Amino acid sequence: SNRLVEEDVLTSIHIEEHEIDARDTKLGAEEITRDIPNISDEVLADLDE
Amino acid sequence: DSEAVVAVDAVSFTLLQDQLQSVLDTLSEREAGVVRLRFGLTDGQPRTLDEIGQVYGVTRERIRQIESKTMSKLRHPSRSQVLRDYL
Amino acid sequence: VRLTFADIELDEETHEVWKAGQPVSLSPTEFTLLRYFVINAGTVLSKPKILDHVWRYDFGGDVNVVESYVSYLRRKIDTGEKRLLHTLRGVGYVLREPR
Amino acid sequence: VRLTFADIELDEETHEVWKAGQPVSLSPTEFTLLRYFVINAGTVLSKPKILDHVWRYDFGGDVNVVESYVSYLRRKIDTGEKRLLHTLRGVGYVLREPR
């Protein structure tokens, strides 16, 4: 019945983790920065500097 | 396999080539040929101005001027919007 | 609304130009060149945008004519060898006070 | 908007450089090389992609031209034998304050 959906009787909180590493390279260094090429702004709204 | 063809960007490149051909054909033929051999589209090598002069019987300053005419007309938003979308 | 820069004064109504308070007579095409040159003071001006904006797009002459124009501007206001309207090789000219 | 690094400073308008506060005159293409160096500060520069981006793709000359140009950059701003413009064998050059 929809009561279970509405009353949150059977609902689970699920958490995932996403690792990402910037490492040294012969090309130089990879930067964790907002200087991201060719991107819009509505998708840049929710990022810190 | 990184070296494998994406099979999506290939069709995109072909349609971009079609759009470029349409845009160039919309421009005057002398300008289209000048820029085509300036950036080496139809052949494997872009060429310097003196080659353009030898193939069109003009001085290199005239080719600089016609190139100025080319990117001036190419900044027209009619082409600018229709091509800038392709990115 | 009069356009002033260092010692050059210009009035957009009757198009008279003052160099250090002295009025000088100036040609219309050179007047447009000077008006553009003040209106973009602090930014280098190269020839292609000069022919693109200031002059008509049907201009089929050589590139030496604008050079003669800036020559008359040199002999008109900044007659000194070092002048407010400096030049850059390949990037045309610019009007700024020398440092 | 002027781009600075250590003791070299660049204005994007009139294409000049200050080295430790002293203005310096420099060649146009040499200036483009310096512009690449500052625009990719902290990242190593290799002769090829330097040739690819800065120089025209029609360049049919040898490879000594870029090495000589780096030598000019050295003798103009980084006159010291040890210099902020470090060189990598087979990997090119880089703009970096030495540690």
UniProtKB/Swiss-Prot annotation, chain A:
Coiled coil: none annotated. Belongs to the RNA polymerase beta chain family. DNA-dependent RNA polymerase catalyzes the transcription of DNA into RNA using the four ribonucleoside triphosphates as substrates. The RNAP catalytic core consists of 2 alpha, 1 beta, 1 beta' and 1 omega subunit. When a sigma factor is associated with the core the holoenzyme is formed, which can initiate transcription. Interacts with CarD, TRCF (Mfd) and RbpA. This is DNA-directed RNA polymerase subunit beta. It comes from Mycobacterium tuberculosis (strain ATCC 25618 / H37Rv).
